[PDB]
A paper describes a structure:
Composed of a diverse array of proteins, the tegument is an amorphous aggregate sandwiched between herpesviruses’ icosahedral capsid and outer envelope. While tegument proteins in general are well-differentiated to carry out highly host-specific viral functions, tegument proteins related to the capsid vertex-specific component (CVSC) have in recent years been identified as key players mediating critical functions universal to all herpesviruses. These include in HCMV the CVSC proteins pUL77 [pUL25 in herpes simplex virus 1 (HSV-1)] and pUL48 (HSV-1 pUL36; also called large tegument protein), as well as pUL48’s non–CVSC-binding partner, pUL47 (HSV-1 pUL37; also called inner tegument protein). We resolve atomic structures of portal vertex-associated tegument (PVAT) and identify multiple configurations of PVAT arising from layered reorganization of pUL77, pUL48 (large tegument protein), and pUL47 (inner tegument protein) assemblies. Analyses show that pUL77 seals the last-packaged viral genome end through electrostatic interactions, pUL77 and pUL48 harbor a head–linker–capsid-binding motif conducive to PVAT reconfiguration, and pUL47/48 dimers form 45-nm-long filaments extending from the portal vertex.
With the aid of our VC1 PVAT model, we interpreted the comparably lower resolution features of [name] (henceforth also considered representative of NC2). Similar to VC1, [name] has a pentameric portal cap composed of five copies of pUL77-u that harbor the genome terminus. However, unlike VC1 in which pUL77 does not interact with pUL48, we observe five lobes of density in [name] resembling globular heads of pUL48 that bind portal cap’s outward face, forming a decameric pUL48/77 complex. Despite the lack of ordered binding/low occupancy of a subset of pUL48 and pUL77 heads, [name] CVSC still contains two copies of pUL48 CBD and two copies of pUL77 CBD, all well-resolved and of equivalent density strength. This indicates that [name] portal vertices do retain a full complement of pUL77 and pUL48 and that although certain head elements may not be orderly bound, these are nonetheless flexibly linked in the vicinity of the portal vertex. However, whereas [name] decamer lacks extensive contact with its underlying capsid ([name] decamer is spatially localized only by portal cap binding of the genome terminus and flexible linker–CBDs anchored to the capsid), the inverted nature of NC2-inv’s decamer allows each pUL48-l copy to wedge within a valley-like topology between each asymmetric unit’s P hexon tower and adjacent CVSC helix bundle. [name]/NC2 portal vertices do not exhibit any features comparable to the notable filamentous densities seen in VC1/NC1. One plausible explanation for their absence could be that filaments in [name]/NC2 exist in an “extended” state [similar to that observed in detergent-treated HSV-1 capsids mentioned previously], as opposed to a “retracted” or “capsid-draped” state as in VC1/NC1.
Residue numbers in the entry:
A (entry chain I): 1078 to 1370
B (entry chain L), I (entry chain H): 1 to 49
C (entry chain I): 50 to 392
D (entry chain Y): 3 to 115, 122 to 245, 259 to 306
E (entry chain W): 1 to 290
F (entry chain Z): 89 to 175
G (entry chain X): 1 to 241, 253 to 306
H (entry chain J): 197 to 245
The structure:
């Protein structure tokens, strides 16, 4: 054993870092939805026939836990999804679905935005002012800082709406959720972590360097959250800016085809037909960056 | 709680001081673990006990 | 018959922390009473300048700002195991037969191998722990460049609107430069980006003009460290600015020692003031300024030359290094090979 | 500096495979009948005590007498055994059917079922090391299977015995051998069962007379409740020398049960590895 | 094998140079590792290290807590290492104010899960708990590490300070007006057969009595009401076979003048304890008595 | 009550049939009771045939018949004549 | 405070003679009990003589001796004695004093001394109406027999005539063990035996209530289809009075057996003495043995 | 070469799926080198690799 | 509350000690403020921090 003591000799940040190069995607960048039946394994329908019929249609098996002790164990934390026989597209990046009114603004998805429909970045709020932080996040008699509407999804931005009870970890654990499964919505919907992250500028960036990071198992098919100290913590800029990035998607195969025919930079534009649209990606990841090297 | 009065009385090493931002900005946005800011001349350093 | 041609062993090459280019970022000091101290603080006293004001305007009061910086602990540990058989053959002999001597010599060499591998592992662990601390205090490019661009306007705690501009710049520079080398290979763009990184870091308060200076030219201002792949890409891009250099570095650690006055104050007050006598002499002579700092005074006496690559970045000569040799064939991951998430 | 080991020698000549087979057991628990400095290979292990008319009860009673030694070193012409001392830390090989975990209390049991070493009409049968709850459950299973041994003509009883016979522990299941072989129960298990039944029968009739008299006096008001319970079990359904004889019989039958009623802890565990075949333990006498 | 060698005094193991020093001297090599003195080389305490989640290490961060291994009903985290303090939430002898204090301290998923796993099965406590030693070292982390002593004294790396065993006050028992010099420490779990659910009491007893039968006699006197409860349940409730009114296991020895009262501060909450100032760990197994 | 103590080799199916035997209750309507009685008897006959280690219907679509287990010929005859008298 | 002493020096506060020091030297390696560990103690607190009393009960003496501290005798100096309190699990050389033979490999227990044969030996230390009575170190079978017979005497005393109890005490007093006969001195029914009687009655009643019909009926069923000296003997000790077992459940049977094991441990602890030494050696004259201390 | 530094262990599923993807990409990219490019820098880099 | 370990470690000047009553009576009946008693050899003076 050796004792080492380090003391910092700068009165500012004497060190810089940058994400210089990227050389593969660990995930599939797929469209496979999250299987809530694994995440909330305890729930059943009160009627045996409705339950069995819905489980057959959804392709799910009967909730298999040696109820009492193994349920207490799972609510303590458990890794309960088997791997597929073969993987060619790496790790399964599952999609978390937020129900959305069919009249949501399509321009909302064209720029990086909070997917819950109302902005919640605490860097715009006065440090340690939890009253103003809570008002900014939830008060729908106040205009949203980004768009100045109350919301673009009433079922996601309010306190106790469907997606708030679904994806806020404090509501998830009043439900019987399995903690081991990673959830993309958690950073935007854990509003208590967001309130607590509301510090001053330099305290915020120091905390970003230390604690505001992800942990995902690298060897499993599914995204399981790992404990601290077994492998590296994963930086996620979306935890600071509190936004999701728009990926190239379309409603029709025609517009995808014209994107493939197009020149370089075609992926970055978001034209629309009458009822059919494209959202272009905001960074040229898929087109040039991943496949250049 | 730091003994700031000894820091004031003791001899010091004169250094070129470099903060990226304004001193008052990095003090006000809590870059430093411990701070003491005072305005005018504070007599506290004179009463040795 | 079966033939056994040569039998071979791993002729491993060792790594030493002070031979690393990363050591430039460190002022390494050896202190034998480190198990006894638990606090290290450095006190700063700074009075701001000010500007005379016009008639009818408020005037600026003179203000003293004082800060304290505290040291951080991070010990490292590695085990090595010796079996009972080696422990008994290392010490017991039986009539001294040549087979018994063979076993005795083999036990001695097993002990030596374990000690050597463990010491090398301690050198590597020092490199690794230093790199991790250095990472944890190092913000990304968009944060530091936003700070350098917004540096002049804020003159106290940030306004609501000033920090709105800070946030806007965070997002813009976050998207603009997320994976630098994939987005572009333009020689001038990469040169200017690296110059921005070099100029963004504030200076350290220790000035040591005799250390890390090249054979002819000038002082080295910092180190730039990355994986072997990234450094090979950069060196292929900017060979016009990169040259092979021989650099004088401290041969060994600087030793810090407690004085008898320090022993008295540590026994009585649980407190140590580094270099007590310099303070007392400057205090009774009426001299307001010490000449040097105790960490600087404890620095090493000897320099040795070692060869390393340097790049010129806007009148700054910084070192280029990869630490692949530290982590090659080990069970630990390079801190500079990372994973990043995007939602 | 040397340590106090025991020397063992083999009469049989050993092949290189036999010696290499021994070097794998360099932390095993080899019991010896008596504290001796130089012993022959015959005295190692339980093979000397095997018989075709006795069973688990006899071998458990014999194991409790022996001296437990850990094998220490293996070489040509010699095996060095260490006899451990109470309160010191030792490495022991896991050879039972179950995985150990830290904090366990281990006890030595007769075995119930490269391979192990045989030379002539010789075999190195080492004892089982299991945590104390598993041993207690195994002993109770064996006793109950013995009591059922006379009703084995019915399928309900045979299903009961097949349920008694399978046991589950930490991520392992195994079937203990039935004490009934060739349709009849061995004499040692027969004596264990007969002694258990006799102590029960003697208590049932003897205890009431004493409980009445002593409950009259008992300030604890506990013995009155005891007599009430005895009256209840009565309701559900002697010459002085003969009273002495029956009391003596009750206590002698209890002494007969003593081998099974209680088992000693010999180790407590603290070590974990993929190498799980071994652990470090402190020895207890 | 000669008289000079027999009459020769044994070498001092402290005067001999180590295995590492002998090797480095044999080849005359030098190492940056310092191998002249080996810490923990002359410690007669047998120790083990246990990894435990952050949620359980309240009141254990200070050296001197008794570490108990509880088995959950399930397979994945087969055992949890809980202290005597968390076990005090289950005890009946603990005053309601102390119980509220303890429940306010232990408010994590791990501790509440420990309590649930305890109350969930049918077994008694002692058929469910295995006693490890007492604790003296903690490194903090989301998965924390405690070093525990199986047989010895509790002390620093240099024995420069020696730790005591901490007993929460409501769990402390003493049964003689004047103590003898040496007194043995026992852990007793006694079951009350009131109504629907057996209620346990958790005690730690210091007495000079080492003989088993004398101790069990005085215990049967002190816990006569529990014995009556046992027999009265047996008569009133057939077919639910109870075993044991209580269990005693011995877990140490101490001196009568090394018993003192103290308080433990945690979250700015004070838990008053009885301390055994040079406790020596020497564990037995549970002995059940009726 | 008798079924739970019996040492069935494979307790899973045994406990399923014991659960369906536990749940059966009359709902005070004439038509429902005959069908709930039929279900209860199916479970109990399966359980009795399990107890005596005899075969049972595994063919899909089939169901164990409502039959006496190991009663003598004369008693089954007497019982069926009595049931015909009730008919 | 002061750590517990291991080596204890004893001084005789009485003018010793040459013969006293001789018969004191013969006692090296003997086990003597003491009530109080102290570096220097006085000879009054040596052995059992301090506890002999007008109560005269043997069970009282056993109970007092159980709670005493056992130490081994080391070399004798003029008017001074050294005693050493042993540690568990170590190996020691132990002398026997009672005329009871030891065997290689059996367990030893401490019990108050009996009397043997003519009771011709009383030439121990006497110093002004003080005596060095040492306890007897006996193998386990004899200790079990002694405790069992005391408990049987006590139980039989209840509701038997004074003379009937006299005859029973006379016959139960005499023990033959390894071809030598020993007699218990002073079997007296005090309260100390009354506690043992109470717990014996409770333990027997709980055994009878816990034992299942399978356990009860095994003996009867074996007698119907097996015959042996063991069976005929044990059934002659018993009262006088195919088909299927009407209740069969292994889980109930195992729960009941576990509880019955607890109760049978309760009853056994009445006659079961604590082992202090385990033997593995005998001097062929049977004067001493090398033992492992178990305390 | 590109994947060498990422595992000192037997490959897991994700790492070897990355290996497979790289196999297919490079197989398509460099199958008839001199007929695809005659760039002096590119061939020098290819031969150096 | 004083630094008793410093009083144990630092050199001392030897005097003849004149308590009128017994030193343990002066200590027990609280003549002195700031009293520290211990028996045997207390190892804590060897703790330096």
């Amino acid at each position: 054993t050796q004792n080492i003591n380090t003391v910092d000799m700068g009165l500012g940040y004497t060190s810089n870092t940058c994400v210089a190069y990227v050389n593969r995607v660990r995930t599939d960048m797929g469209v496979r939805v999250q299987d809530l039946f694994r995440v909330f394994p305890m729930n059943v329908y009160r009627h045996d026939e409705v339950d069995r019929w819905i489980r057959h249609a959804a392709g799910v098996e009967r909730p298999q836990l040696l109820d009492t002790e193994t349920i207490s164990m799972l609510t303590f934390g458990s890794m309960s999804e088997r791997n597929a026989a073969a993987t060619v597209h790496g790790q399964k990046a599952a999609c978390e679905l937020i129900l959305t009114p069919v009249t949501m603004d399509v321009n909302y998805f064209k720029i990086p935005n909070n997917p819950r429909g109302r902005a919640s970045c605490m860097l715009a709020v006065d440090p340690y002012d939890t009253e103003a932080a809570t008002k900014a996040i939830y008060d729908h008699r106040e205009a949203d800082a980004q768009t100045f509407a109350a919301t673009h999804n009433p079922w996601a931005s309010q306190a106790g709406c469907l997606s708030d009870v679904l994806y806020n970890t404090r509501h998830r654990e009043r439900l019987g959720y399995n903690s081991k499964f990673y959830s993309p919505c958690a950073q935007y919907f854990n509003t208590e972590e967001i309130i607590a992250a509301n510090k001053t500028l330099f305290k915020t960036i120091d905390e970003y360097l230390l604690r505001a990071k992800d942990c995902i198992r690298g060897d499993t098919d599914t995204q399981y959250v790992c404990v601290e100290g077994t492998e590296q913590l994963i930086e996620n800029p979306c935890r600071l800016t509190q936004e999701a990035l728009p990926i190239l998607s379309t409603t029709t195969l025609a517009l995808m085809e014209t994107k493939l025919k197009g020149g370089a930079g075609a992926f970055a534009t978001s034209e629309t037909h009458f009822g059919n649209y494209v959202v272009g990606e905001i960074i040229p990841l898929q087109q040039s960056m991943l496949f250049n090297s | 709680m730091e003994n700031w009065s000894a820091l004031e009385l003791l001899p010091k090493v004169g250094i070129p001081t470099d903060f990226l931002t304004h001193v008052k900005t990095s003090a006000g946005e809590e870059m430093f673990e411990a701070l003491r800011i005072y305005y005018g001349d504070d007599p506290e350093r004179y009463n040795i006990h | 018959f079966e033939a056994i041609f040569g039998t071979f062993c791993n002729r491993l090459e060792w790594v030493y922390f002070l031979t690393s280019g990363l050591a430039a970022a460190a002022h390494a000091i050896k202190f034998h009473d480190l198990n006894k101290l638990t606090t290290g603080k450095m006190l700063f006293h700074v009075q701001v300048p000010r500007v005379a004001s016009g008639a009818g305007l408020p005037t600026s009061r003179q203000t003293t700002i004082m800060v304290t910086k505290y040291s951080e602990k991070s010990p490292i540990t590695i085990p090595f195991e010796l079996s009972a058989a080696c422990l008994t053959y290392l010490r017991e002999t039986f009539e001294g037969t040549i087979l018994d001597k063979i076993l005795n010599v083999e036990a001695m060499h097993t002990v030596l191998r374990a000690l050597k591998n463990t010491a090398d592992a301690m050198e590597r662990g020092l490199i690794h722990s230093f790199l991790q601390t250095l990472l944890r205090k190092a913000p990304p490019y968009f944060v530091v460049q936003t700070l350098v661009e917004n540096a002049t306007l804020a003159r106290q705690a940030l306004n609501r609107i000033q920090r709105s501009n800070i946030l806007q710049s965070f997002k813009a520079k976050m998207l603009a430069t997320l994976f630098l080398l994939n987005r572009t290979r333009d020689r001038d763009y990469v040169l200017k980006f690296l110059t921005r990184l070099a100029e963004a870091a504030t200076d350290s308060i220790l000035d040591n003009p005799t250390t890390y200076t090249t054979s002819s030219g000038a002082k080295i201002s910092g180190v730039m460290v990355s994986t072997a792949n990234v450094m090979q890409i950069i060196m292929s891009l900017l060979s016009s600015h990169i040259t092979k250099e021989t650099v004088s570095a401290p041969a060994t650690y600087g030793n810090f020692v407690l004085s008898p006055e320090n022993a008295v104050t540590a026994i009585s007050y649980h407190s140590i003031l580094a270099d007590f006598n310099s303070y007392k002499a400057h205090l009774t002579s009426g001299q307001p300024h010490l000449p040097n700092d105790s960490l600087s005074q404890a620095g090493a006496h000897s320099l040795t030359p070692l060869s390393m690559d340097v790049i010129r970045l806007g009148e700054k000569t910084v070192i280029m290094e990869n630490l692949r040799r530290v982590y090659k064939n080990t069970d630990t991951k390079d801190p500079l090979e990372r994973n990043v998430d995007l939602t | 500096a040397m340590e106090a080991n025991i020397f063992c020698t083999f009469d049989h000549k050993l092949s290189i495979a036999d010696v290499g087979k021994l070097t794998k057991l360099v932390a095993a628990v080899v019991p010896i009948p008596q504290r001796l400095h130089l012993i022959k290979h015959y005295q190692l292990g339980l093979h000397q005590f095997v018989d075709h008319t006795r069973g688990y009860v006899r071998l458990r009673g014999l194991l409790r007498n022996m001296t437990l030694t850990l094998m220490r070193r293996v070489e040509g012409n010699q095996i060095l055994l260490h006899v451990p001392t109470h309160g010191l830390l030792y490495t022991v090989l896991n050879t039972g059917p179950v995985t150990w975990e830290k904090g366990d209390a281990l006890c030595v049991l007769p075995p119930l079922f490269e391979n192990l070493l045989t030379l002539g009409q010789w075999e190195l049968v080492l004892p089982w090391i299991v945590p104390m709850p598993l041993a207690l459950e195994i002993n109770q299973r064996l006793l109950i299977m013995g009591l059922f041994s006379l009703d084995r003509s019915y399928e309900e009883v045979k299903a009961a015995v097949q349920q008694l016979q399978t046991i589950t522990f930490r991520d392992a299941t195994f079937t203990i051998p039935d004490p009934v072989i060739d349709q009849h129960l061995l004499i040692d298990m027969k004596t264990a069962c007969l002694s258990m039944s006799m102590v029960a029968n003697l208590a049932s009739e003897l205890t009431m007379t004493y409980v009445r008299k002593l409950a009259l006096e008992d300030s604890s008001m506990l013995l009155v409740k005891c007599q009430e319970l005895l009256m209840r079990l009565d309701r559900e359904r002697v010459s002085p020398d003969d009273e002495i004889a029956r009391l003596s019989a009750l206590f002698v039958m209890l002494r007969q049960l003593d081998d099974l009623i209680r088992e000693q802890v010999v180790f407590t565990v603290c070590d974990v590895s993929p190498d799980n075949k071994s652990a470090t333990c402190i020895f207890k006498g | 094998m000669d008289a000079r060698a027999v009459a020769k005094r044994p070498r001092d193991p402290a005067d001999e140079d180590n295995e590492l020093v002998t090797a480095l001297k044999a080849k005359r090599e030098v190492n940056t590792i310092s191998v002249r003195y080996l810490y923990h080389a002359d410690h007669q305490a047998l120790t083990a290290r246990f990894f435990v989640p952050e949620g359980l290490v309240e009141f254990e961060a200070q050296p001197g807590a008794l570490l108990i291994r509880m088995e959950t009903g399930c397979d994945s985290p087969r055992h949890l290492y809980i202290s005597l303090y968390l076990l005090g939430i289950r005890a009946s002898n603990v005053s309601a104010s102390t119980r509220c204090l303890l429940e306010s301290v232990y408010t994590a998923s791990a501790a509440r899960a420990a309590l649930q796993w305890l109350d969930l099965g049918p077994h008694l406590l002692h058929r469910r708990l295995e006693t490890l030693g007492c604790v003296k070292t903690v490194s903090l982390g989301i998965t924390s590490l405690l070093t525990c002593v199986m047989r010895g004294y509790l002390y620093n790396t240099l024995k420069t300070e020696v730790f005591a065993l901490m007993i929460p006050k409501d769990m402390y028992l003493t049964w003689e007006e004047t103590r003898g010099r040496l007194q043995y420490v026992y852990l007793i779990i006694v079951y009350d057969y009131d109504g629907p659910e057996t209620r346990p009491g958790i005690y730690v007893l210091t007495s000079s009595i080492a003989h088993w039968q004398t101790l069990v006699d005085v215990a049967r006197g002190k816990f006569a009401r529990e014995r009556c409860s046992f027999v009265n349940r047996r008569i009133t409730r057939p077919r639910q076979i109870p075993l044991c009114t209580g269990v005693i296991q011995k877990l140490g020895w101490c001196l009568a003048d090394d018993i003192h009262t103290s308080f433990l501060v945690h979250k700015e909450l004070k838990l008053s304890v009885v301390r055994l100032d040079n406790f020596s760990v020497e564990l037995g197994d549970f002995r059940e008595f009726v | 009550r008798r079924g739970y103590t019996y040492p069935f080799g494979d307790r899973g199916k045994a406990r399923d049939h014991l659960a369906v035997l536990d749940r059966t209750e009359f709902d005070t309507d004439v038509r429902h009771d005959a069908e709930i009685v039929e279900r209860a008897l199916v479970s109990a006959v399966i359980l009795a045939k399990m107890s005596v280690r005899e075969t049972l219907v595994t063919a899909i679509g089939q169901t164990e018949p409502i039959a006496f287990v190991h009663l003598k010929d004369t008693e089954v005859q007497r019982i069926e004549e009595n049931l015909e008298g009730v008919r």
